[PDB]
DNA sequence: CAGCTAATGGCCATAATACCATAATAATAGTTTTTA
Protein backbone atom coordinates (compact mmCIF):
# COMPACT_ATOMS: atom_id res chain seq x y z
CA UNK A 1 0.00 0.00 0.00
CA UNK A 2 -0.96 2.28 -1.36
CA UNK A 3 -2.85 0.08 -3.76
CA UNK A 4 -5.63 1.18 -6.07
CA UNK A 5 -8.45 0.35 -3.62
CA UNK A 6 -6.16 2.10 -1.18
CA UNK A 7 -5.88 5.07 -3.55
CA UNK A 8 -9.20 6.66 -2.82
CA UNK A 9 -10.28 10.22 -3.21
CA UNK A 10 -8.01 10.67 -6.21
CA UNK A 11 -11.43 10.62 -7.85
CA UNK A 12 -14.98 9.95 -6.69
CA UNK A 13 -15.59 12.98 -4.49
CA UNK A 14 -19.24 12.26 -3.67
CA UNK A 15 -20.37 9.13 -1.81
CA UNK A 16 -22.65 6.89 -3.91
CA UNK A 17 -21.01 4.12 -5.96
CA UNK A 18 -17.93 3.55 -3.83
CA UNK A 19 -20.25 1.00 -2.35
CA UNK A 20 -21.73 0.22 -5.75
CA UNK A 21 -18.77 0.52 -8.08
CA UNK A 22 -15.73 -0.27 -5.93
CA UNK A 23 -16.12 -3.90 -6.97
CA UNK A 24 -14.14 -4.86 -3.90
CA UNK A 25 -16.63 -5.14 -1.06
CA UNK A 26 -18.51 -8.27 -1.99
CA UNK A 27 -15.49 -10.52 -1.44
CA UNK A 28 -14.55 -8.49 1.59
CA UNK A 29 -18.12 -8.88 2.76
CA UNK A 30 -18.49 -12.63 2.88
CA UNK A 31 -14.81 -12.60 3.76
CA UNK A 32 -15.28 -11.14 7.16
CA UNK A 33 -18.71 -12.75 7.22
CA UNK A 34 -17.62 -16.37 7.17
CA UNK A 35 -14.26 -16.03 8.79
CA UNK A 36 -16.24 -13.98 11.27
CA UNK A 37 -18.37 -17.06 11.60
CA UNK A 38 -15.13 -18.54 12.82
CA UNK A 39 -14.57 -15.48 15.03
CA UNK A 40 -18.09 -14.74 16.06
CA UNK A 41 -20.73 -16.41 18.22
CA UNK A 42 -17.82 -18.69 19.08
CA UNK A 43 -16.44 -15.67 20.95
CA UNK A 44 -17.37 -12.01 21.32
CA UNK A 45 -15.24 -9.07 22.38
CA UNK A 46 -15.99 -6.13 24.64
CA UNK A 47 -12.64 -4.88 23.31
CA UNK A 48 -11.49 -3.42 20.03
CA UNK A 49 -8.06 -4.96 19.57
CA UNK A 50 -8.65 -8.72 20.14
CA UNK A 51 -10.83 -8.78 17.04
CA UNK A 52 -8.34 -6.92 14.85
CA UNK A 53 -4.68 -7.60 15.47
CA UNK A 54 -5.15 -11.38 15.12
CA UNK A 55 -7.84 -10.58 12.58
CA UNK A 56 -7.33 -8.83 9.32
CA UNK A 57 -9.54 -6.30 11.02
CA UNK A 58 -6.24 -4.87 12.18
CA UNK A 59 -5.41 -4.34 8.52
CA UNK A 60 -8.43 -2.09 8.80
CA UNK A 61 -7.54 1.12 10.61
CA UNK A 62 -9.06 4.09 8.85
CA UNK A 63 -6.94 6.98 10.08
CA UNK A 64 -5.01 9.89 8.69
CA UNK A 65 -6.19 10.85 5.21
CA UNK A 66 -7.72 8.80 2.47
CA UNK A 67 -6.09 5.99 4.51
CA UNK A 68 -9.17 6.73 6.59
CA UNK A 69 -12.03 6.45 4.26
CA UNK A 70 -12.35 3.20 2.28
CA UNK A 71 -11.18 1.00 5.16
CA UNK A 72 -14.04 2.38 7.18
CA UNK A 73 -16.13 2.32 4.08
CA UNK A 74 -15.07 -1.27 4.47
CA UNK A 75 -16.48 -1.12 7.96
CA UNK A 76 -19.84 -0.21 6.47
CA UNK A 77 -21.52 -3.53 6.16
CA UNK A 78 -18.70 -4.94 8.23
CA UNK A 79 -20.20 -3.75 11.48
CA UNK A 80 -23.43 -5.32 10.23
CA UNK A 81 -22.07 -8.49 11.76
CA UNK A 82 -19.37 -7.02 13.90
CA UNK A 83 -20.43 -5.03 16.93
CA UNK A 84 -20.34 -5.64 19.94
CA UNK A 85 -17.66 -3.50 21.32
CA UNK A 86 -15.44 -5.46 18.99
CA UNK A 87 -15.50 -2.30 16.84
CA UNK A 88 -14.78 -0.35 20.04
CA UNK A 89 -11.91 1.73 18.72
CA UNK A 90 -13.40 1.54 15.20
CA UNK A 91 -16.24 3.34 16.86
CA UNK A 92 -13.80 6.13 17.64
CA UNK A 93 -12.89 5.83 13.98
CA UNK A 94 -16.54 6.42 13.18
CA UNK A 95 -17.22 9.58 15.13
CA UNK A 96 -13.77 10.61 13.94
CA UNK A 97 -14.87 9.97 10.36
CA UNK A 98 -17.15 12.89 9.52
CA UNK A 99 -15.13 15.55 11.11
CA UNK A 100 -12.77 17.07 8.58
CA UNK A 101 -13.07 14.03 6.29
CA UNK A 102 -16.73 13.81 5.34
CA UNK A 103 -16.16 17.53 5.53
CA UNK A 104 -13.25 16.97 3.16
CA UNK A 105 -15.82 15.10 1.09
CA UNK A 106 -18.24 17.95 1.93
CA UNK A 107 -21.87 17.14 1.00
CA UNK A 108 -20.31 14.10 -0.70
CA UNK A 109 -23.46 13.49 -2.76
CA UNK A 110 -27.03 14.52 -2.09
CA UNK A 111 -27.67 11.54 0.17
CA UNK A 112 -24.03 11.34 1.20
CA UNK A 113 -24.09 12.96 4.63
CA UNK A 114 -26.58 10.27 5.53
CA UNK A 115 -24.49 7.67 3.80
CA UNK A 116 -21.77 8.24 6.34
CA UNK A 117 -23.49 9.17 9.50
CA UNK A 118 -26.50 6.94 9.03
CA UNK A 119 -24.91 4.11 10.79
CA UNK A 120 -22.07 6.22 12.07
CA UNK A 121 -24.50 6.99 14.83
CA UNK A 122 -27.10 4.43 13.95
CA UNK A 123 -24.57 2.01 15.29
CA UNK A 124 -24.30 4.23 18.38
CA UNK A 125 -27.75 2.93 19.14
CA UNK A 126 -26.81 -0.62 18.19
CA UNK A 127 -26.50 -0.89 21.98
CA UNK A 128 -27.65 0.90 25.12
CA UNK A 129 -25.10 0.70 27.92
CA UNK A 130 -22.38 0.31 25.33
CA UNK A 131 -23.21 3.90 24.48
CA UNK A 132 -21.96 4.71 27.95
CA UNK A 133 -18.77 4.44 25.92
CA UNK A 134 -20.34 6.56 23.20
CA UNK A 135 -20.73 9.32 25.70
CA UNK A 136 -17.96 9.14 28.19
CA UNK A 137 -14.45 7.80 27.72
CA UNK A 138 -12.79 8.75 24.43
CA UNK A 139 -15.55 10.90 22.90
CA UNK A 140 -13.48 13.52 24.59
CA UNK A 141 -13.42 16.09 21.83
CA UNK A 142 -15.09 13.80 19.38
CA UNK A 143 -18.84 14.15 19.34
CA UNK A 144 -18.67 17.81 20.25
CA UNK A 145 -17.06 18.93 17.02
CA UNK A 146 -18.98 16.14 15.37
CA UNK A 147 -22.36 17.60 16.31
CA UNK A 148 -21.16 21.08 15.53
CA UNK A 149 -20.47 20.26 11.93
CA UNK A 150 -23.33 17.83 11.59
CA UNK A 151 -25.88 20.30 12.75
CA UNK A 152 -24.09 23.10 10.94
CA UNK A 153 -24.51 21.41 7.59
CA UNK A 154 -27.82 19.71 8.04
CA UNK A 155 -29.60 22.94 8.79
CA UNK A 156 -29.60 24.23 5.25
CA UNK A 157 -29.78 21.38 2.74
CA UNK A 158 -33.42 21.04 3.61
CA UNK A 159 -33.39 24.78 2.97
CA UNK A 160 -31.46 23.89 -0.15
CA UNK A 161 -33.64 21.10 -1.43
CA UNK A 162 -36.48 19.81 0.73
CA UNK A 163 -37.74 19.06 4.06
CA UNK A 164 -37.81 15.92 6.09
CA UNK A 165 -34.40 15.05 4.79
CA UNK A 166 -32.94 16.83 7.78
CA UNK A 167 -35.56 15.38 10.03
CA UNK A 168 -33.88 12.11 9.22
CA UNK A 169 -31.04 13.74 11.02
CA UNK A 170 -33.20 15.50 13.56
CA UNK A 171 -33.69 11.97 14.67
CA UNK A 172 -30.02 11.37 15.07
CA UNK A 173 -29.94 14.60 16.96
CA UNK A 174 -32.56 13.25 19.30
CA UNK A 175 -30.76 9.98 19.46
CA UNK A 176 -27.67 11.60 20.86
CA UNK A 177 -28.15 12.95 24.22
CA UNK A 178 -28.07 11.37 27.57
CA UNK A 179 -25.17 13.61 28.60
CA UNK A 180 -22.69 14.26 25.77
CA UNK A 181 -20.80 17.40 24.77
CA UNK A 182 -23.40 20.19 24.77
CA UNK A 183 -22.63 22.46 21.83
CA UNK A 184 -26.04 23.76 22.65
CA UNK A 185 -25.84 27.32 23.94
CA UNK A 186 -23.92 27.38 20.71
CA UNK A 187 -26.91 25.80 19.02
C1' DC B 1 -99.45 105.41 -23.65
C1' DA B 2 -96.35 105.37 -21.38
C1' DG B 3 -92.87 102.91 -23.41
C1' DC B 4 -93.34 97.33 -25.97
C1' DT B 5 -94.00 94.31 -24.27
C1' DA B 6 -92.63 90.31 -21.79
C1' DA B 7 -92.02 86.03 -22.06
C1' DT B 8 -89.21 85.90 -26.40
C1' DG B 9 -84.27 84.87 -27.65
C1' DG B 10 -80.18 82.67 -24.19
C1' DC B 11 -78.30 80.01 -19.75
C1' DC B 12 -74.91 79.69 -16.25
C1' DA B 13 -74.36 77.52 -11.39
C1' DT B 14 -75.60 74.21 -8.96
C1' DA B 15 -76.80 70.30 -6.92
C1' DA B 16 -77.88 65.96 -8.12
C1' DT B 17 -76.43 62.09 -11.12
C1' DA B 18 -73.32 58.90 -13.28
C1' DC B 19 -69.00 55.93 -13.73
C1' DC B 20 -65.80 54.30 -11.80
C1' DA B 21 -62.83 52.91 -9.19
C1' DT B 22 -59.83 51.29 -4.52
C1' DA B 23 -58.64 49.03 0.81
C1' DA B 24 -60.49 47.77 3.99
C1' DT B 25 -60.60 43.32 5.08
C1' DA B 26 -61.80 39.17 4.73
C1' DA B 27 -61.61 34.18 0.13
C1' DT B 28 -59.94 31.64 -3.47
C1' DA B 29 -57.30 28.76 -5.51
C1' DG B 30 -52.76 27.42 -5.99
C1' DT B 31 -48.43 25.26 -7.54
C1' DT B 32 -44.92 22.56 -4.56
C1' DT B 33 -44.42 18.23 -0.81
C1' DT B 34 -44.17 13.25 -0.92
C1' DT B 35 -47.51 8.69 -1.17
C1' DA B 36 -49.03 5.94 -2.92
**What is the distance in angstroms measured between the alpha-carbon CA of A71 and the sugar C1' of B9?**
116
Which technique was the structure solved with, according to the deposited record? cryo-EM
Handedness of CA A118, A122, A124, A126 (dihedral sign): negative
Q: Is the CB of A163 under 7 A from strand B?
A: yes
Resolution as reported, in Å: 6.6
Q: How far is CA A109 from the centre of its chain?
A: 16
Gap between the Cα atoms of A39 and A56, Å rounded:
11
Q: Is the CB of A162 under 7 A from strand B?
A: yes
CA neighbor of A176 nearest in space, from A109, A96, A121: A121
Q: Is the CB of A111 under 7 A from strand B?
A: no
- Secondary structure, 3-state, A34-101: HHHHHCCCCCCCCCCHHHCCCCCCCCCCCCCCCCCHHHHHHHHHHHHHCCCCCCHHHHHHHHHCHHHH
The dihedral over CA atoms of A145, A147, A152, A155, expressed in degrees to the nearest 10, equals 180
Q: How many helices (H) and strands (E) does chain A have?
A: 9, 0
Q: Which nucleotide, over all strands, has the C1' atom closest to the CA of A163?
A: B33
Non-local CB neighbours of A50 within 8 Å, separated by 6+ positions: A86
Amino acid sequence: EQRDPTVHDDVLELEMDELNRHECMAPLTALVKHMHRSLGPPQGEEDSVPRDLPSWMKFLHGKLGNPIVPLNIRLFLAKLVINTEEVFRPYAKHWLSPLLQLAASENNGGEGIHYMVVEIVATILSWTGLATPTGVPKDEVLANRLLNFLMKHVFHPKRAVFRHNLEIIKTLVECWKDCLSIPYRLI
